[PDB]
Design a protein around this nucleic acid. Structure first.
Length: 231
RNA sequence: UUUUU
């Protein structure tokens, strides 16, 4: 059997609906084989490109800083801060998030930035807009680990995970789109079980009272009953 | 989907 044919017939076992049999050709197979987009650009768990750039442009206008200096200077600081403290929406009560200027592995001064103009501008929640930087956050935490002064991950410490070697997987903005092995899947997921620590209520206590009974009277008569004379 | 202050 020097030659063993070529097959490559495709389809066969794969059931094809009758409406698609006229377009489900062999040449159609090769056309869709090229459509393999990144598995981190299609899911709804992250902000889309249209609303990611909206977040980038809106927050730099509020800070009155250029996009070039935003993507270079304060974005890594924001990623580090989101590594230290969580990325929850109700972090706005801090009213300020801190960035520290570093001279040579030694703090010199802490800078203060408003936290509202960076959370509300993330249209599909800030937990989703920061998921694009989840892969960069792990690398930056590893860099901090190599420097001898590891970061303190809020999720890992809160969940009870004291392992500093892999204290990530406690990052609040990991979508798990990365090829996590089965031994890190449960470590990340048990940390994710910090959600059941606190409840959530969907609706507040309404607006003010619509009405509490009204009054309408005039003239000179009894206190409340207008000329009460019936029997 | 949200939910990890």
């Amino acid at each position: 059997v020097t030659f063993e044919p070529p097959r490559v017939t495709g389809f066969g076992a794969l059931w094809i609906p009758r409406q698609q049999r006229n377009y489900m050709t062999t040449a159609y197979i090769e056309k869709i084989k090229a459509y393999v987009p990144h598995s981190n650009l299609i899911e709804s768990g992250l902000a889309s490109e249209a609303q990611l750039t909206s977040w980038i442009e809106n927050t730099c206008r509020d800070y009155q800083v250029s996009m070039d200096v935003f993507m270079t200077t304060v974005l890594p600081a924001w990623i580090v801060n989101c590594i230290i403290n969580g990325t929850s929406q109700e972090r706005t009560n801090e009213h300020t998030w801190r960035a520290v200027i570093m001279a040579n592995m030694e703090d010199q001064e802490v800078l203060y930035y408003p936290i509202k103009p960076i959370i509300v501008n993330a249209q599909p929640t800030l937990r989703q807009v920061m998921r694009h930087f989840g892969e960069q956050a792990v690398a930056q935490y590893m860099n901090s680990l190599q420097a001898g002064k590891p970061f303190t991950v809020k999720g890992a410490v809160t969940a009870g995970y004291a392992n500093v070697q892999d204290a990530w997987l406690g990052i609040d903005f990991l979508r798990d789109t990365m090829q996590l092995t089965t031994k890190q899947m449960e470590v990340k997921h048990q940390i994710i079980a910090a959600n059941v620590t606190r409840r959530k209520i969907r609706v507040f206590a309404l607006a003010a009272p619509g009405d509490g009974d009204e009054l309408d009277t005039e003239r000179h008569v009894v206190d409340d009953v207008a000329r009460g004379r019936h029997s």
